[PDB]
Amino acid sequence: FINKRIVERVRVGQILAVLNRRFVAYKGKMRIMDITQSLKMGTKLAAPTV
Amino acid sequence: QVYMHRDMLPEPRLDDIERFRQEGFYYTNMLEAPPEIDRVVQYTYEIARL
């Protein structure tokens, strides 16, 4: 006994009921990149900050 | 002491050419007196960067 429904017998009418999670995605116009690489070496300056 | 201030290139009347020719006329970038205080703003590298 595992107390989890790993395998279920489901009628054809209830196949699509599994869709309940919420997902968020970006678009092609948006571009995502890692700022970490731009931290390479670190040659630069910075507007004055304390 | 280098200042920046928008100014006009003079356009003479030139209605009586002899009278204008008799009176010497000229234009310079030189300033007779330094600009009056409280009419000027002070800038530097860090102000411009900010």
What's the Cα-to-Cα distance from B34 to each of A9, A27, A37, rounded to whole Å?
93, 58, 51
Reported structure resolution in angstroms: 3.6
Contacting residues of B for A47, CB less than 8 Å apart: 49-50
User: Which tokens in the block code for residue A19?
Assistant: 């869709």
Helix (H, G, I), strand (E, B) or coil at A25: coil
Method: cryo-EM
CA distance B12 to B22: 13
CA distance B10 to B44: 31
Asked whether B34 and B1 are in contact (CB, 8 A), the reply is yes
Contacting residues of A for B48, CB less than 8 Å apart: none
User: Which tokens in the block code for residue A25?
Assistant: 């995605």
- The closest alpha carbon to B29, from B15, B9, B49, belongs to B9
CA distance B40 to B7: 15
Asked whether B35 and B3 are in contact (CB, 8 A), the reply is yes
